[PDB]
Structure formats: structure tokens, C-alpha cells
Amino acid sequence: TEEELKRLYRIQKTLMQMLRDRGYFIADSELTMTKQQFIRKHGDNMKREDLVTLKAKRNDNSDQLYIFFPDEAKVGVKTMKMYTNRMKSENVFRAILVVQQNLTPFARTCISEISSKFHLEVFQEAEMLVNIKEHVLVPEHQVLTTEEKKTLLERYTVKETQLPRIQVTDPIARYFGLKRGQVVKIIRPRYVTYRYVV
Amino acid sequence: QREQTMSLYLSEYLSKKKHGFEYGSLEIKNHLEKLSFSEIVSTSMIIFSPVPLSPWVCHFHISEKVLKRKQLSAESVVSSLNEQYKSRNRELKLDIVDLDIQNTNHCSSDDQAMKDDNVCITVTVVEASKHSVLELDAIRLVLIPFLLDSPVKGDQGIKKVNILWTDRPKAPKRNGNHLAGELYLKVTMYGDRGKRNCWTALLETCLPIMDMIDWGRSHPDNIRQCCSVYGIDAGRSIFVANLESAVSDTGKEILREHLLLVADSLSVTGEFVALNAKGWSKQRQ
Amino acid sequence: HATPFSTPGVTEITEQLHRAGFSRWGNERVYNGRSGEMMRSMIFMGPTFYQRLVHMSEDKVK
Amino acid sequence: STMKFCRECNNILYPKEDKEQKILLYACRNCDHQEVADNSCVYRNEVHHSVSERTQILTDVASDPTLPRTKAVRCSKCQHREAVFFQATARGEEGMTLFFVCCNPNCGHRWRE
Amino acid sequence: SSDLQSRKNLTEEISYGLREAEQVCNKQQLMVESWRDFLAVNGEDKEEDSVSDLARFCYERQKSATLSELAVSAFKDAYRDVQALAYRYGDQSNSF
Amino acid sequence: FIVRLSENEKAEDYKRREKVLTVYFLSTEIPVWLLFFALGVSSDKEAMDLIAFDGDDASITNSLIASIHVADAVCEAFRCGNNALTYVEQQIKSTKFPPAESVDECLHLYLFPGLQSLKKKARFLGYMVKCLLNSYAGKRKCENRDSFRNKRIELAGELLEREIRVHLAHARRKMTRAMQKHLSGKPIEHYLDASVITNGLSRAFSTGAWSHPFRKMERVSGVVANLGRANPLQTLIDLRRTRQQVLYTGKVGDARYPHPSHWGRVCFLSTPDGENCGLVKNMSLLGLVSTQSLESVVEKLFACGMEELMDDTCTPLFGKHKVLLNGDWVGLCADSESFVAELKSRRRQSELPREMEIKRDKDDNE
Amino acid sequence: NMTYSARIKVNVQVEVFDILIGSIPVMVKSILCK
Amino acid sequence: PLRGAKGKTTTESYVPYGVIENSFLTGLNPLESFVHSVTSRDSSFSGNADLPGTLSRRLMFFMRDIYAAYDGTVRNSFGNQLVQFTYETDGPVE
DNA sequence: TCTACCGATAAGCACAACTACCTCTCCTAT
RNA sequence: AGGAGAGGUA
DNA sequence: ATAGGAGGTATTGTGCTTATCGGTAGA
Ligand SMILES: [Zn+2]
Ligand SMILES: [Zn+2]
Ligand SMILES: [Zn+2]
What we know:
The structure is cut from a larger assembly and holds 1 copy of chain A (about 200 residues), 3 copies of chain B, 3 copies of chain C and 1 copy of chain D (about 110 residues). Chain A has about 200 residues and is an alpha/beta fold. Chain A folds into 2 domains: about 1-130, no CATH class; about 130-200, no CATH class. In chain A, about 35% of the residues lie in helices and about 20% in strands. Chain A has helices at about 1-20, 30, 35-40, 75-90, 105-115, 145-155, 170-175, and strands spanning about 55, 65-70, 95-100, 120-125, 140-145, 165, 185, 190-195. The radius of gyration of chain A is 18 Å and the shape is globular. Chain B has 8 helices and 10 strands. Chain B has helices spanning about 20-30, 65-70, 75-85, 135-150, 200-205, 225-250, 255-265, 275-285; strands spanning about 10, 35, 45, 55-65, 100-105, 120-125, 150-155, 160-165, 180-190, 215. A 4-stranded antiparallel β-sheet of chain B has the order 8-9-1-10, covered by helices on one side. A 4-stranded antiparallel β-sheet of chain B has the order 3-4-6-5. Chain B starts with 7 loop residues before the first strand and ends with a helix. Chain C is an alpha+beta fold. Helix content of chain C is about 15%, strand content about 5%. Chain C has a two-stranded antiparallel sheet. The longest helix of chain C is centred in the first third of the chain and has 10 residues, at about 10-20. The interface of B and D includes residues 39, 41, 46, 71 and 163 of B. The complex binds zinc ion (3 copies). Chain F binds 3 DNA and RNA strands through helix 7. Chain B: It is found in: Nucleus. Chain B: This is DNA-directed RNA polymerase IV subunit 1. Chain B: Component of the RNA polymerase IV complex. Interacts with NRPD2, NRPD3, NRPD3B, NRPD4, NRPD5, NRPD5B, NRPD6A, NRPD7, NRPD7B, NRPD9A, NRPD9B, NRPD10, NRPD11, NRPD12, RDR2, RDM4, CLSY1, CLSY2, CLSY3, CLSY4 and SHH1. Chain B: It comes from Arabidopsis thaliana.
């Protein structure tokens, strides 16, 4: 049981670090929370429910992301329908789902069908054990906005398709929550480069 | 690839203790090495002893010297066998509803007394009020191979771990570059099943020793799947390092810009395509 | 005799060459044919057996 | 992994268990003869790893791993950094203690932790 | 060599160097997990066994690949010194 | 005659898939124990005594027990009566092209023709199974294709023989077709075509395509080459060469490297460089190729002290070494050293053919 | 530019109720050579 | 070991390892000559020379379209795809 | 409880197994 | 004139 | 237009495209 508790503590710490990197106004107390303090605040049992929380963007309070932890593994269509109904009721456009096992193909099709209305991100528990961003091999990644993307396109007089491509399934894109059509800035240890998400 | 070579680096807090790196590396190797039960047991025999218990009780007599060398105990190996039996239980398609293992220092076996300091492990099969397991061929051909293939230490995924010394690691440390020559571990994992990633299984097996292993520099040695774990840039950097190593081994001198251009050309679509026709066709598509 | 597995020793060859009135190492003092001066270093000379191959110059001209 | 021939017809015997008899017995299908068993042993095999016969020489199975080498430790008799370290028990002590063996061909010195 | 005596001395030195290199390779072959008890600092009565078994070391080396690699590495390391004797036994006028 | 040790896949469930001994005789897949008991054997103990493994291995015993169980399951009450003979006859008759001879006659001519007795061939089969078990256990080394001890070379007595045989067969087919076409509706000279064989030989010598030793089609190449008249040395070395046929040129194996069996037979220091590197080997100066001996050696062997093979399978062998002549068990000898010494003494007195090899090995005890 | 071969003669008898078959090339200095 | 196996189970494969005390000037022993021939049998067969040619051909097919543009960027000939925004040379002439 | 695709295990099918080269011999049914 | 097969060079 | 039985044997090696083979998930 204690192994599961420390696993969940590591997952929560990595999730908070990723949210802080993405800029969702994460409090310093959560980032600097120790294992002993987390266990003391945990109580007797977590039941994968206390990890559910809602976070809003630092720049704009209108945008918010809800983190959902299913009670049991191998979720089905009913659980996804309940989650999307809850999102519609709460009026949230983004959500992060952390699951223990791979999703049902029917659940994946349901997520893809409703991807236009709301954006859903799925992360495995094993993938969140180690923070990908905090690595020596991974260089600094900076997400460019629409104005900066337009300035970059106009400066080199190039099209969006005539840029180096990065797949959505890459861990960095999912870590930064990058959608299709967004460019990034990479600084190597100096010469810089840009990658187009496709 | 089936070998799927890995690379693990020790943490920086082990240097405070005297000879901390060597002890940590040896502990990691001991904990993360697959040791089959057959390598410890010497003589396996089935003795007719006569939920009700079934006949044909199997005996596994193990010398104490092997356990002392491997730093194990009879209780520990019995617990590991029970845990692995209750972990999968996919094989053994017969009446093995219950399987209990008992440990006895001395057994009532008068067949041979060559070794006096050997501990005997008793495995008893339980049948659900049926005689379907009364035959000897079935147990001898199914249960005996199953127990010998059960690893008492490590994980089934990890094949072998060796300790190596290097001076130019693929992932340099941020600070403290004055340390000329570090020590790291190389892990090889089986690729029998492609359903689960080798790195994913490796992360789960290192939960008790997460602090010891420095995950800030550890990275798979492969190039194709490293982009799916640490991004395209990390794979490109490792590819550049491997290309430089190959050029150095070839004995020729090649400028950096050529290798960088090769790396950027082979990873322009976000993935390292092969040099065959299929890779070029996919890149053009 | 020059049997491949019964070759005479180097000492025997040197003694045989010394008894002939030449240097035991097979090198003899020579003089440059262009200026007449004596070379500082002796040049090894010996009647080896050579062969002529069937590949010619005009056979490769294209 | 044991077999014997009954004296009546000189044919192989297969082991069997009888609930009423509660004793190991051997009888053959060739003739009708039941004989009492000895030592109550029906299988006895020494565990060996000789499965890949005539294949361990070509492909290196790494049956005996090589001891690790380190360069951080400095030898005493000579100023050589390369050394071999391993864990082994003492003559009468308990636990595993770290040992060191110098890699200098001209030194041949070994010391404990 | 300058004369016959120098040639004989060089031949004897080469023979002794090859013997020393072979001994070094035999010593290096023991760096395996099977000889951890012998390599430890304790009391072992099988010291003469590892020395008298001279014809078995080559057979063991020819069967394993890691042992062969260790042996060839040790042989090169011990044979660099043997190769270094040419500068001592060679004159400055040698064309080679 | 092939004896194969492999996992059973016929009438075997998932629980029982252990290795068993099978016999591939005339493509029948007969169990080994049924064949053993068909050749005048009526006891399991006698069959085990014939296969003198002389070792303690669990795998061998398990394989033997599995083979016995498979034989028992395949045929019921095979030990009693002659049910094994009926089963093997049915298996032979089940083939696509069964032999015309009956079961009582097929076992005498198509099964070990060297041994006339029906019980001696059972002992030979037991010896073969013993050798297979010893090789499986690792006590006996397996044969290698690189060594010259297990290889033979043919220059003209066999290379041309198969071409002559196939051309004669084609000529006979044409002649009988013409005879059938002409009988229904002539000198014998017109019946036989005298040009078919000559044209075939001319084509073989010109194109260089020679008949494959084991395939009717897929003619091999490189058998016949041209001489070189640049110098007498070239035409002398062209006449003295040895060629080994390999399936593919890119990879061969260990044949490209020299072998200790080349000592004094072929030149290991000289070999062509290129695709056929090591495949073409030049013969040594003192190299001779043995020819078939018209004299009978069996008669002279009994005079030296050789004892004939025992017909009865019940009598075992205590220490008598096996005597094999051209792969045929001819007899037995009490002491091998004295026997081989006497044979060598007789050979040195011109009482035996000068081209004969006498091999004595204490490991194989033969 | 012809073939150095020798003819083959063997008697063939037919029954109801030396002919030429082929030429084999002859190696120089063989058992049958001038 | 040269006579098949040393009989210490029977081996099937070996890794040759020999030391030759004699030199070319002194004269090679027949067994030493055989060992030298076995060792030098390598490079006599030229069948692996296709690997560099095939690798060079494939790499050239992949990298032929790469050229430098007037804007200072590195672009591919197919669709003017941007490979490198700026050349990563460590000087000294641009 | 019966549909409904959905990843694994064998079974074939298709290229790839090097340049610049230079000679000779043999080939085209019946 | 085009092919098939062998021995060969850098 | 006709002709060219039948034999146990003795290239790999990577991608690609099936089929089939169970196999759970949803109503
Ligand atoms: Zn016991
Ligand atoms: Zn009986
Ligand atoms: Zn030292």
C-alpha cells in the first residue's frame, strides 16, 4: 500500500511540475510539498479521489483545466460519457485524464469523435514517473504564440508546411499540450531551430 | 530490436559515503538481476508421501552454500515463489486451485544422504476433491518446468546487467565536469513481448530504488524508440554522439557540420526514417 | 638448396657471402653515375629471379 | 525418470497409486504382475543448465560474468588507478565486504575496503 | 643486432618477454565471478592448483569469447613493452 | 535409413510434447520401438541392452520412456504376436509409391543390405540409436562438413558415371516408346538411337553443365573448365584441383578456412582469392586418390583373428570391439591393438591392398 | 576441330514368344590411346 | 585442441589463440605457418565490399537534394523544405 | 444472454545481396 | 550483332 | 505438332501482405 502511496506522490509531483511549466498558476506549497507532508495531508486512504482538482490559467482566469483520476482501471464508454457530461456542466474546455491501463478502443473512438468540442489528454501512470522536461538531453522548449508565429513566417518568407515537423504523439508535445498548427522554439547548447506540430 | 540496451547512471548523493558509488552499483545489480530458481536448486525429485491434499509431493533440496553466496534465505525464496505463482497463474491448466510450499531443514528422505547441510523445499499440490492430478507425467512435464523458470530475484524482463566504466558519457552532467570518468550500469531486457515498452517495465521495477538511480541522465541506448520517450531532440543528440563515436572508431576525421546536417536531414519529419525505399517514400508522403 | 622448410640459417648465408670476397650483409659500395661521387650509404644488390606478366600497356589503351 | 523391468515378463513398469493400498506399486500392461516399490522414488533428476547443447561455444551465453573495474580507487604499492572490485565473505565474518584487486600486471596487490 | 652475442641476448629477452606476457594473460583470466573466493584476502590451499594447471588455461580461453577478449587485451598491453625493445636493440642507421 | 529425435506432434496433446525417437524409413514415420520388436525382439530389457548407453542421464531415460509409451499407444498388444510387422507393412503400403515387394522381402533388401540376418540388423539399429543418444548427451562429437575425414572426391569414375546412366535411361525410354509405337500396327539397330547419348555428352562437355548428384534438374556448373597454355605450370596446376559446391557464394561457413585435415593432402597456403576463396584447393605434391579394390578383404580378416558377429540378440558383448568395413558391421575382435598391428603387418607384406585405411579409436570402442 | 571419342559396341538380343549406342570422349594417354 | 577436441563433455567450436615465438627472418615452423595462414585467411574473400557502396548510394540518394540558399538557410530541393535555419559550422567563412 | 471489430502467429511474396573493368568459350531446339 | 557460362585486373 | 515420375533431400534475409484466431467490449 505504501508503494502505491509513494507512486501516487511521485505522479502528483510530476503533474504539478508539468502544470507549472505550462503556466497554470501552481502554488509553491504544492511544488515544494515533501513526501511526509503529502502523506500527512493524505490521511488514511486516498482512493484516487483527492488528486482530482481544477486549475486555472495564470494569465486568464476564464481558461481552466480539470484533472480526473478514475477509481478503477480499464475505463469504458460510460465513464467517458460521465466525464464529458461533468465537463459540459462545469463549462471547461480542457481536461487531463491519468489512467492506469490502456484505454478501450471504443473509449478512444468516443474521445476522438468529441475532440472538436473539447480537448482531452490521456497520460499513463508509468509515463509520469519521471519528468521528461527535467532531463539533460532535452533542450529548452518555448511555445510561440500566434503573433510570434506570424512574425517568424514573415521574417523567413516561408510557409507553415515548409518547416521541420514534430509529431503530436511525441512526449514533448503532450507534455506542453501542443495542438496541431503551433510552432515551437528550441535553443541548443548558440543556434536556434523551430519545429512545426503536425 | 529484441536486446533493447538501456543505460542507467548513479545519483550524485552517493559520493558523500566512502566508496558509495561501488556499493550502490553492486546493490542495484543485485536487486535488478534475474536469477532463475533452477540455478540455485541442485537435486529435484518427486516422492510419494502416502481442501484435501494430492499425492506425488515434489521435493527441492537446495544446498545452503549457494544461498549464502547469493545472500538469500529459504523463507525468502518460498515467499518469492508464492508471490510469482499468485502473480500470473496463467499457465498450469489443471487442478492447482491451491498451491502451498513448506520449508523443512531436514526431510525424511533415506534415498541419499550425500549432503548434510542442504535445506529441502517441499511443494504440495492441492486438488479440489478430484483425482485429475493423480498422474505423474502431467506434473513432471508442466509444474516442474514452471518452478525452475520462476526467477527468485530481479524481474523477468531484465536479461543481464553489467557494470562499466566510461569517460565520455552520452549524457553529460550539468555541473561538476572536473570528475574525469564516472561509473554507470548497462541493462539488457528481453523483447519476447512487444505489447509493453521495455522502459515502462524498467521504471516499474525500480520503484524501491528510485532515489539511487539518477533519472536526469538515464536514457535508452536505442535510437528509434528514444524519440518516443525523451523527444526527437534527445534521439538526435544520441544519434550525433553515436555517429561521432563511429567516426572516431573508423580512424578518420570528419567535421561537426557534416554530422549535424546528416542528423537534421534524417529527422526532418519528426522521426528517424530508414535508408531503404520505404523510409524515403514515407518521408516524401 | 632453398627448400622452404629447410632454409639455411642467416649466419651460413653471411659466411658464404663473406668467403666470396663481398660484404657479409649483401650491400656493396657504389658510385653515382651522374657525378662520380661515392655514396655515403651502401646499396644492397643481388640477382633475384623476376617474372614478366601477360598484362601489357597497349592492351589497356582505350 | 526411473524405470525397471518386472521379473515375470521383462517389460517396463509404470508407477501408480492406490487409495486403498496407500502404497506405491509398479505393474506393467504387458503381463499381470504387481510388485512392491522400493524407496518410494518415482523421479530423481539433477538440475542442470545443459539445454542449449552444442550452442554455448559459438554464441557467448555469458555463463561466467566478468568482474567490474573502477578507476576512482588508487593503489597503494603502485600509483595505478585501475582496479577490480567485488563482494565476498570473509573467513569467519558475516555479510558481504568489498574487496579490491590491482589491475597493474607488475603489482599483484589486493586489499579490502 | 651488432653481432651474434647481441642476437642471442635479444632472442633470450624476447623469449622471456613472451613468457611474462603469457603469465600476465593467465593471471588476467582469473578476473571472473567463479574465482571470487580465491581472489579474496583469506586462506586458500588451492594456490598451487591455479599455477600447475597451465595446459587448461588455453583450453578455457579458446572456449569463451569474453575470456578471449580479456586475454588478447592483456597480451597487447604486455607486448607493447616487448615491441619497445626494437629502439634499444636497433641502430640509428636502420632503414626500417 | 533415418532416426530422428524430436518432439512428438502426432496424437499428442499440449501436456505431452516431450522428445521421442522416430524412424523415417521409406517415408513411413514408424516408431523406433515397433521396428525394434519387429526385428526378432520380444523383450524390453533386451532392447535396452542392445542400446548400451552406459551412462546416467535423465533426459535419455525420459526420451526412451516417451518412445515406449508412444509405441504402446500407436499399436495395441504389439509385443504379443507379430502385430508390429502388420503395422509396419500397413505403414509401408500407405505410401504414395509403395514398393512392389512384400513386407517379408522389403526388410531384407531395402533395410541394411550388408547384414543378411534379420536379427543382426536389429543390433545395427541398436548401435545407431546408441550413437545418436551419445551424440545428444554430448559424449560423442558430431560430424563436420569441413573435415576431409568425412569427405570423398570423384574425378572421372563417378562424375561421368551418372551422366552415362541418365543418358542411357533417356535412350531406353525413347527406344521403348518407339517399340510401342511400332509394335502395334524392324532391325534392332534402328530401334536404339545412337545419337542421343553422344549429343548429351557433347552438350555436357561444351556448356559445362553437369548433372546434380541428388537432383535430376538444376544442373551444377564449374565442373568442366578450360586449360591454360600460357606456361606449363598453369596447365599442371589446373589438372590438380579440388572443388566443393556451395549453395550460395556470399556465405559458405568454415569451409573457406584451413583445417588440420589438410595436412599433407591439399595445399593450405595457396588458394584463389575472390568469390571462390577457399573452395578451390590445390592438391599437394604427395597426393594420391584411392581407387576401388577388386580383391575381397572380408576373407582375409577372419584369418587375422576377427570373430563373426553374433546372430542372437540375447547374447551381449563384454569387451569385444566392433569391426566396421565400409560402414558394415562385419565382425568382432577381442583386442583392438593386436588386431590392427597384425593388419598393418599383413599390409606391409603386400598381402593386402596398398590403399586401405585402418582406424582404431578407444573413445568409440570400435 | 572434331571430337576425340571412341565407339561402343555391345550385343543386344531380342526374344519373342553388336550395335552402336554412343561415343565417349577419350582422355589422352588412357587405356585406349595411340 | 587441434585434434578436434581436448576431451575436457566434447566441444564443438573453438576460438583460436596462438603465439608465434619465431619470426620471418628465422623461419616459420610448419605448424606456425599453418596458424599464420589461418589467421590471415581474412581479407582474402571480398564479399562484404558491397556494404560501403550500398550505404554510400543510399545516403547520397537521401542527401543529394540538400543545398544552401541565398538567404543563408539550408533547404531541400523537394518543395524548398527547411532543413536548417542557419548552418551550424564553427566558422570561419560564411 | 449475442454482435463487433481488434491486435497477435504463421505463410507466403518481393527485392537485395557492390564499382570501373578485360579476355575467352559457347549459343541459337527436334 | 545480341545473349549465356568461366578465368581474371584496379 | 510431339518429346524433354518423382527422389530424401542437402541461401538467407529483411520488409509486406494476407489469413485466422481467438479475444474481450458493448447492448
Ligand atoms: Zn526432502
Ligand atoms: Zn510383466
Ligand atoms: Zn598496484
